[PDB]
Amino acid sequence: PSSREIKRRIRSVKNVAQITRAMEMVSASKMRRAQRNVLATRPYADRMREVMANLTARVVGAARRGTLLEKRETVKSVALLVVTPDRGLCGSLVANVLRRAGRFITEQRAMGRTVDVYTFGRKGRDFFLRTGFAPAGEATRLGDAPKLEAILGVAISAINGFQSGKYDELYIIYSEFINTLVQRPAIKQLLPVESPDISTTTNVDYTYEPGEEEVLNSILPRYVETQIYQAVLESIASEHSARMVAMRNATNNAKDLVRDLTLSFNKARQAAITKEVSEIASGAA
Amino acid sequence: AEYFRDEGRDILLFIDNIFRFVQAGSEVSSLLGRMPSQVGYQPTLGTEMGELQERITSTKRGSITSMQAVYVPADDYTDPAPATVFSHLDATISLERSIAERAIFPAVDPLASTSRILDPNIVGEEHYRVAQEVKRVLQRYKDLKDIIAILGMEELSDEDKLTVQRARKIELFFSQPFTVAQQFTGRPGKYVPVKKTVESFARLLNGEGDHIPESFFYMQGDFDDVLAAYEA
Amino acid sequence: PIHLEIVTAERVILSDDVDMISAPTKDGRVGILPRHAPLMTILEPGELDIIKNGERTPFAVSGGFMEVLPHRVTILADTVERADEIDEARAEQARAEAEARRREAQSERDMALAEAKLRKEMVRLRVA
Amino acid sequence: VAGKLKGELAQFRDLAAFAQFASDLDATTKAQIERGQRLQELLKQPQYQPLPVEDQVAVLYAATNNYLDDVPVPLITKWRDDFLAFLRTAHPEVRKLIYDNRLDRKFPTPEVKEALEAAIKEFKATSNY
Amino acid sequence: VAGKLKGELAQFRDLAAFAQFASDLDATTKAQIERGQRLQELLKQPQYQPLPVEDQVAVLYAATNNYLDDVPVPLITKWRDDFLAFLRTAHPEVRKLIYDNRLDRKFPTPEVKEALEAAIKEFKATSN
């Protein structure tokens, strides 16, 4: 506080404000393109949604409700999927999703179900490595526009684990994009338990050339992979939105601190001028 | 000016950079050998600023209204010079460079320009209500300026897009066709009383005028003139 | 005389109308004319013959879950490539589009973001 | 000529925060950022090389018009030097014409307009950057 | 002994923000962060407990020759104190050996490098 250190501080926080505003702008463009990608992925997702509803409408017997469609009893092992940002600055989003994952692990262990972690994004990977859980499936360096082929390394592993009895149920934790400003973590069930939607009510009778059971066993894994891809893209959009909000708040805070530091600098400047003129007047007299 | 004030006339006194009066006083005090004061200013800063700017009053016979340009040393308004000037001020008008980039008509920043007399008891309840509503709308636009720059007009929800459009139109409606002007634009001069201005802005805030586009508010002058311009 | 939706998870490539389409179903190749009865099927690697007004454009499909209805037909294909003429617009696709994604969209942009995160961190602790 | 230069430089000073992020930005924002960078590199000058008003106004007319877009930023100074050498040697007539009617209120008259545009186009076609 | 100390401390001081909330560093920046924290904790000394020259020489030799890398950060003051206690009691001959030839041009003589590295290894194995 010597009217020169405060000047350096003011310059520093001004640089912070400029960098943060630039981050907010690029995060806005990122959110735009991520929303575009989500909407471009929407047709596959919803078409397969009503296709699955129609298929499970016909497959109603317990005997043929096997493989991925079976509603297993006496659940023993549960796998949860977590999608997290690869980088920080997201604000409370990473903390929120990891708190949700931790508490969900708490209830799943409360009922006696052993839990295994499958993580997208470096933040969740690092957190779960530090806390103790070894990543059963690890996938990082997912860009803002990931391809479905990039998720296979985890999704196929989870589906094979469920098929082999390793996991009796499957979950995903992702950041839902409620608004441009408001985002919460969400929980979804990955064992199908499909909805008796209008499609399920639809009685359009079909023909299954390779076979009903074969079509079922070939479409359930792809439906699950589509759900995971939707969740990952939703999480990417929420990541960019949360970074936008965090950087807007940081820019506003930096501007407020620049204002306060400018007030302090002006006070120091006036004090320095008063001190020097008082000393000069004393020396003259 | 006091001769004409004593004649009962209303006089407007323009002082260019009262801060230069303050600095001249500081220099005179320094040359006279007086001890400095708090930035090196004259010890008699308050008394000198009171000798001036205290004969500027409204008396029973006449009145001397004033308008003093003020150069704030650096950006320090707390500087003894602008501080002692603000001690003697009844209104402030803030010309801003950003609005001056395109608005060469009076570029007064409505949010940074205040006035002591703008209170219900003096200018009436209607004027205060209209002025506060205009300032509220312009403040909402100022807050949403960053959102508009970053997100766009689409993310901005309903019931605020109307206010943003209204704020654009009302910032455009702070234009006045002058009787005398620099680089005379040819528009006829207009003298709009406060009684007309209050009702005009009230009606602009009352939904009327939402039809005419924003760009046709350059130097319109009155809400009756707004309706006349919309008719053509 | 029916609208065919070539739907991939990444994007919807075609939602146009097609005179005739041949499905490389697992059990064996099938052909579909507009008023086909309802059908679901598993496609295989091969050529997807979008025969539109006499022109057969063979689209390489690595997998499909084609849904057929009298009024509409839709394929949910894991990977669809033109595999017909001028390859796949290699002028930019798989080239400028690829580089713009791996470098412009991934590499240089992430380098700049890391630079900004840095400059933040450093000039943030210059405040102290 | 220089009114558009001043406006564009003001816009670039406003958008200077986004310069390092030029890749991921809107098309118009990118166009503004590289326009401002071109102008800033143009205003860079060597020592003891003052420019007569005709050279300055010809260069700034080329810059304000979308004539230097194909020129990369680090070559704008060389572009200016080569173009001024071209006008000095190849086309003294357009320089004299620009100097003669620099005081006309509507300065971009069709004659000087087309002469200067032809000179700039000839320089751009002859040279490569 | 102290040139490496000074250089490593300077590098760590240059690398300030990265230590404290940058989490995306390799084990090249983070290695310097770790070593600098080791050395800084080494300098933390109580009051009224001066250390003779041979003591500081031995401690800094242990620290700068990577013999202290595995020790966690908060326990380094206790590690130094325990190593000194071991050195007073378990081996006073090495202290005498250090103090006798602290003035030779090439201090890490093989007679001194031996019986000092040996003591460091003995303390490392015996304790923790």
From Swiss-Prot, chain A:
Transmembrane segments: none
Location, primary (coarse class): membrane
InterPro entries: ATP_synth_F1_ATPase_gsu, ATP_synth_F1_gsu, ATP_synth_F1_gsu_CS
Superkingdom of the organism of origin: Bacteria
Gene3D superfamilies to which the protein is assigned, alphabetical: 3.40.1380.10, ATP synthase, gamma subunit, helix hairpin domain (1.10.287.80)
Record-linked Pfam families: ATP-synt (PF00231)
GO biological process terms held by the UniProt record: proton motive force-driven ATP synthesis; proton motive force-driven plasma membrane ATP synthesis
Subcellular location: Cell membrane
Gene Ontology molecular function, alphabetical: ATP binding; proton-transporting ATP synthase activity, rotational mechanism
UniProtKB keywords: ATP synthesis, Cell membrane, CF(1), Hydrogen ion transport, Ion transport, Membrane, Transport
Cross-referenced CDD domains: F1-ATPase_gamma (cd12151)
Bilayer topology annotation: Peripheral membrane protein
Any Gene Ontology CC annotation: plasma membrane
Biological role stated in the UniProt entry: Produces ATP from ADP in the presence of a proton gradient across the membrane. The gamma chain is believed to be important in regulating ATPase activity and the flow of protons through the CF(0) complex.
Similarity-based family: Belongs to the ATPase gamma chain family.
Assembly description: F-type ATPases have 2 components, CF(1) - the catalytic core - and CF(0) - the membrane proton channel. CF(1) has five subunits: alpha(3), beta(3), gamma(1), delta(1), epsilon(1). CF(0) has three main subunits: a, b and c.
Record's protein name: ATP synthase gamma chain
Gene name of this polypeptide: atpG
UniProtKB/Swiss-Prot annotation, chain B:
Cellular localisation: Cell membrane
Organism of derivation: Chloroflexus aurantiacus (strain ATCC 29366 / DSM 635 / J-10-fl)
Protein role: Produces ATP from ADP in the presence of a proton gradient across the membrane. The catalytic sites are hosted primarily by the beta subunits.
Sorted UniProt keywords: ATP synthesis, ATP-binding, Cell membrane, CF(1), Hydrogen ion transport, Ion transport, Membrane, Nucleotide-binding, Translocase, Transport
Family: Belongs to the ATPase alpha/beta chains family.
GO MF term set: ATP binding; ATP hydrolysis activity; proton-transporting ATP synthase activity, rotational mechanism
Oligomer status and interactors: F-type ATPases have 2 components, CF(1) - the catalytic core - and CF(0) - the membrane proton channel. CF(1) has five subunits: alpha(3), beta(3), gamma(1), delta(1), epsilon(1). CF(0) has four main subunits: a(1), b(1), b'(1) and c(9-12).
Portion held of the full protein: 237 to 468 of 471
Record protein name field: ATP synthase subunit beta
Chief location category: membrane
GO CC list: plasma membrane; proton-transporting ATP synthase complex
From Swiss-Prot, chain C:
Listed GO CC annotations: plasma membrane; proton-transporting ATP synthase complex
Lineage: superkingdom: Bacteria
Main location: membrane
GO molecular function, one term: proton-transporting ATP synthase activity, rotational mechanism
Membrane topology: Peripheral membrane protein
InterPro entries on file: ATP_F1_dsu/esu_C_sf (IPR036794), ATP_synth_F1_dsu/esu (IPR001469), ATP_synth_F1_dsu/esu_N (IPR020546), ATP_synth_F1_esu_C (IPR020547), ATPsynth_dsu/esu_N (IPR036771)
CDD domains in the record: F1-ATPase_delta (cd12152)
Positions in coiled-coil regions: none
Localization per Swiss-Prot or TrEMBL: Cell membrane
Biological process according to GO: proton motive force-driven ATP synthesis
UniProt keywords, alphabetically: ATP synthesis, Cell membrane, CF(1), Hydrogen ion transport, Ion transport, Membrane, Transport
Region (Disordered): 88-109
Pfam families found in the cross-reference section: ATP-synt_DE, ATP-synt_DE_N
Record NCBIfam families: ATP_synt_epsi, PRK13446.1, PRK14735.1
Self-association and partners: F-type ATPases have 2 components, CF(1) - the catalytic core - and CF(0) - the membrane proton channel. CF(1) has five subunits: alpha(3), beta(3), gamma(1), delta(1), epsilon(1). CF(0) has three main subunits: a, b and c.
Family assignment from sequence similarity: Belongs to the ATPase epsilon chain family.
Role description: Produces ATP from ADP in the presence of a proton gradient across the membrane.
Full protein name: ATP synthase epsilon chain
Record organism: Chloroflexus aurantiacus (strain ATCC 29366 / DSM 635 / J-10-fl)
Lineage summary: Bacteria, Bacillati, Chloroflexota, Chloroflexia, Chloroflexales
Gene: atpC
UniProtKB/Swiss-Prot annotation, chain D:
Subcellular location field: Cell membrane
Similarity annotation: Belongs to the ATPase alpha/beta chains family.
Assembly mode: F-type ATPases have 2 components, CF(1) - the catalytic core - and CF(0) - the membrane proton channel. CF(1) has five subunits: alpha(3), beta(3), gamma(1), delta(1), epsilon(1). CF(0) has four main subunits: a(1), b(1), b'(1) and c(9-12).
Role played: Produces ATP from ADP in the presence of a proton gradient across the membrane. The alpha chain is a regulatory subunit.
Protein name from the UniProt record: ATP synthase subunit alpha
Whole sequence portion shown: 393 to 521 of 522
